Design a protein around this ligand. Structure first.
Ligand SMILES: *[C@@H]1O[C@H](CO)[C@@H](O)[C@H](O)[C@H]1NC(C)=O
Ligand SMILES: *[C@@H]1O[C@H](CO)[C@@H](O)[C@H](O)[C@H]1NC(C)=O
Ligand SMILES: *[C@@H]1O[C@H](CO)[C@@H](O)[C@H](O)[C@H]1NC(C)=O
Ligand SMILES: *[C@@H]1O[C@H](CO)[C@@H](O)[C@H](O)[C@H]1NC(C)=O
Ligand SMILES: *[C@@H]1O[C@H](CO)[C@@H](O)[C@H](O)[C@H]1NC(C)=O
Ligand SMILES: *[C@@H]1O[C@H](CO)[C@@H](O)[C@H](O)[C@H]1NC(C)=O
Ligand SMILES: [Cu+2]
Length: 153
């Protein structure tokens, strides 16, 4: 199981609820995180165990409230972060530039939802972050952006 560190999840973390769409926070939120388009952005999570596979899908719907809202026109998932295996528990953090996705409406002021998709052997698990894309963002605290390492797993 895992928590989003930055950008922050839609609502209160409930481990049991991670099996549901957006961790059972189905409704979009209005307290969105400003997320930079200048290439300084990242996604940071914390996993309780490893190994696991993680990726993220994205919705450019302001009201993203179902799986459909994360699919492209041909009905495939809009992948924001490609799936990979992670071999250490604790913090995992990937740079994320939304400008690098070929998705319409990625621009200053655009609303989106990033859904992290996690598989670590105890189910398919989900958490969502509601963001607003901005050209630049003031005072981005990058201190959560590290990869933990464990000599003995
Ligand atoms: C938005 O507000 C909800 C409910 O108050 C809160 O639980 C959530 O953590 C907030 N989102 C962010 C990114 O802080
Ligand atoms: C939360 O989701 C429920 C069920 O879909 C919906 O009826 C309700 O209006 C939503 N509330 C908000 C605050 O979006
Ligand atoms: C994006 O979300 C914010 C915060 O809820 C909202 O005020 C704004 O009007 C939305 N923008 C669009 C284009 O829907
Ligand atoms: C839809 O997303 C899938 C991956 O989930 C991708 O292979 C496909 O090219 C996309 N379709 C379009 C219309 O771009
Ligand atoms: C960044 O957040 C950390 C806690 O994670 C805190 O110690 C620090 O004050 C923050 N950095 C700035 C410049 O505010
Ligand atoms: C974490 O490791 C991944 C490779 O899995 C790498 O792409 C990423 O840049 C690393 N993040 C940090 C903060 O070093
Ligand atoms: Cu778990």
């Amino acid at each position: 199981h895992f928590q989003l560190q930055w950008p922050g999840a839609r609502g209160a973390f409930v481990a049991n609820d991670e099996v549901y769409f957006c961790g059972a926070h189905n409704n979009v939120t209005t307290n969105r995180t400003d997320f930079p388009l200048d290439g300084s952005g990242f996604v940071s999570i914390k996993s309780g165990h490893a190994p696991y596979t993680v990726g993220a899908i994205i919705s450019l719907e302001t009201d993203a409230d179902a799986w459909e809202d994360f699919k492209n026109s041909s009905g495939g998932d809009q992948i924001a972060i490609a799936y990979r295996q992670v071999d250490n528990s604790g913090t995992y953090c990937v740079p994320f530039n939304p400008s690098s996705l070929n998705i319409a409406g990625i621009q200053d002021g655009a609303n989106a939802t990033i859904q992290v998709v996690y598989t670590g052997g105890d189910g398919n698990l989900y958490q969502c972050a509601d963001v607003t894309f901005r050209t630049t963002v003031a005072n981005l605290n990058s201190s959560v952006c590290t990869n933990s390492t464990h000599h003995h797993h």
